[model samples]
Target: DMLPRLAPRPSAAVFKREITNADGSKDIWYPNGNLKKISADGMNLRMLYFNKDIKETNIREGTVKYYYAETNTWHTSYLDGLEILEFPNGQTEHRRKDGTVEIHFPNNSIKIVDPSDTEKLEEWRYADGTHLVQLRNGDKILNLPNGQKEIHTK
Candidate 1:
């Protein structure tokens, strides 16, 4: 025996534009008809005001470093006394004289360090660095304070 098959109906319908005005007069000129085409430039400008006052405030005050691939050397920048180190892999590591290190990845991942703790494996905090716990999986299980753990998967 053969089973009956049903076809699907159109989920949406498209309407034609009405050229004439509501009073049946001549068609009105659409001012924005070609506005999208005219505004399709490649460049885009974005301005963001930090506060409601619209005052000139330095949003970022830190050092930035860059690594030259050809020269095989790293360069540093200083902003408000913070040292910024840029690596060739596009990763940046910011260090302050107060022993705080921040590692920023190309994919927007960030790790920040608080006061140094020599007893641990270099405790680092993540972007949402608040009471986050790390999980481990493998032959051996290990857990540490402040959600710090090491996982080795085979």
Candidate 2:
């Protein structure tokens, strides 16, 4: 497996408290009640929070991964306010921070919800080229694979 090996720990490191173990791992305590732990190989790093949240960063993928024990969820954050969540129910969610969420299910179905407007909108796409949309105005639209379109008005 490909992993990242970091440079040697700085001799002039800055932290509130620091501890080194015989296994070459290290624990760094910051001032804000947050702690960081580095693996012996320097390839894995973990940010431990006070609220039972842990953020682990491995150089292999370099993605910011977080875990919340209370929610029992794993979150992967890419950009500001953009995150992806993996739930225990075989569904993955992409949060766009603008009150929009896209969920992907195990059966190749997708659901998109946007609640930013005055009325919320929802859409779903199934595996068989079936598209369904619920507009904010309480109208529904369906498009089938055979070029058939159906509209339902509220």
Q: For each candidate, what TM-score against the reference?
A: 0.32, 0.63
Candidate of highest TM-score: 2
After aligning candidate 1 to the native by TM-score, how far in Å is the CA of 58 from where it should be?
18
> For each candidate, C-alpha RMSD in Å?
21.9, 11.8
lDDT (Cα, tens digit) per residue for candidate 2, span 1-154? 0122221111110048889999999998877777889999988899887666788887776678877666667878764677787766666778876777788887778888776663537788999989998888898889998999998996
Poorest lDDT segment (10 consecutive residues) of candidate 2: 5-14
Q: In each prediction, how many residue pairs overlap at the backbone (N, C-alpha, C within less than 3 A)?
A: 4, 0
Report the C-alpha lDDT of model 1 over 1-154, residue by residue, as the tens digit: 0111121121111122325434443322223331111112312211112211111112243323333334333445565567555554566667787787777766555655546553233333344443222223223223445677655445
